[PDB]
Design a protein around this ligand. Sequence first.
Ligand SMILES: N=C(N)c1cc(-c2ccccc2)c(CCCN)s1
Ligand SMILES: N=C(N)c1cc(-c2ccccc2)c(CCCN)s1
Ligand SMILES: [Ca+2]
Ligand SMILES: [Ca+2]
Lengths: 12, 12, 227, 227
Amino acid sequence: KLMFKTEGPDSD
Amino acid sequence: KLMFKTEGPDSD
Amino acid sequence: GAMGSMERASLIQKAKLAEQAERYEDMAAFMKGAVEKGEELSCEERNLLSVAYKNVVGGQRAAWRVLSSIEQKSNGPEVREYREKVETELQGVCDTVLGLLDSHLIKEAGDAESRVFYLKMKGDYYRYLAEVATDKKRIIDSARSAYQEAMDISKKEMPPTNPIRLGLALNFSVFHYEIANSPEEAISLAKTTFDEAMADLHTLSEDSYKDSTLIMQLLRDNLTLWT
Amino acid sequence: GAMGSMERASLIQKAKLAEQAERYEDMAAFMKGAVEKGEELSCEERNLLSVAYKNVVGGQRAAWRVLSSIEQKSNGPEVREYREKVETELQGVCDTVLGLLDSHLIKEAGDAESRVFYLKMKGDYYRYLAEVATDKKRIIDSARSAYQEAMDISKKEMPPTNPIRLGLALNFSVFHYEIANSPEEAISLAKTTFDEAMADLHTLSEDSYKDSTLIMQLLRDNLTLWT
Ligand SMILES: N=C(N)c1cc(-c2ccccc2)c(CCCN)s1
Ligand SMILES: N=C(N)c1cc(-c2ccccc2)c(CCCN)s1
Ligand SMILES: [Ca+2]
Ligand SMILES: [Ca+2]
């Protein structure tokens, strides 16, 4: 999936 | 520490 | 529970060690123990709790999407069974964090910086449940409600460059875009949030400017993809 | 134990899913369950078991070195206490893998490719115990003995380009260099291993050539650092 920008660590 | 090359995934 | 015999300050110290060791499970368990001491969290302590669970739930979300994509491609029980196993552990982490927020972080959060932080987390981890949810409507409405309450307080109480406010609006716009299937709401929230922050940057120190522009750039990255 | 009611083939399938999801704890638990079915492992199954535990023990070794370095810098109990916590879980994973090798993978391994693989693992995870060991002499002698038995069989039974043989000698040289404090033995083993593989490459397919030169390059990277 294209994951959008959300706050804090992109740990996924 | 300088970790030397050992076989398989350097997962450390 | 597990951390009931360790000192509050030792749990916080050990959560900081865990972060440096990238032991995010340990970091989450220590911060859970810290919360269960029943005292309010400082700003640094709120950040430790959030970073810890975000790193844990991140691993599970990455894992879930890999498995869900294999499952969909394959449409034996093993793929469905293991996807469920991961989904169930993901739901357990979300349920644990929501448990901490309801018992009793939110009801004792009076200041805007703490209350908006906790309601954002509440929207966030209902959104993580939403991602894997096939009852889905209620979960989605729980996220919206937490987000909206956070947004109302942030607009009244915080300047438009407030990084917590900026992070809230970033996440709520992504909620709008891919959970509520309201991409137009997403785009509107991201533009208005960006432009309002831009017009307040003149008020900030160098340090604060860095902080706010980093989150503004995340709103721009999303807008670039969405338009 | 935990995996006693799942089918052998389902554990193997689920270990492969876990690897793709980067769920290395799950991958190790499934491969442990696969081993405890009591049937010998295929070459692919040995690789799954090794990759799984290597990824798990890797996280713990990285974690341990970060904590040990803070501990040393700081020379309250928290740093020592958390370093111990991580060290104890690291020892538990090493003890679990050694348990599988002794009960009963090694005694049922008759072929060179399987027996050398298992003795290498035995030397490897005694070396991981050696890293955190302050009795240390016996652990170190356990690693040497496993490595040496592996080396004797590999020299007699496998060509010098055999990737398992090459990986064994890579690891045993690192054992020599930083566990036995015999850097001269390390350098000699790495040079002789490299040069003997070089003179046998002419015998290999394109596919096998790739396989052997990748491990040879690891011997060269170490020799570059050591000389
Ligand atoms: N341990 C961590 N990763 C974090 C610690 C803190 C913090 C440190 C001092 C005072 C308040 C908050 C974060 C706030 C984020 C703002 N830049 S994040
Ligand atoms: N699942 C994994 N990461 C691995 C699978 C296999 C394998 C696949 C077919 C037959 C034998 C072994 C590995 C061998 C390594 C040689 N290049 S590694
Ligand atoms: Ca399963
Ligand atoms: Ca501890």
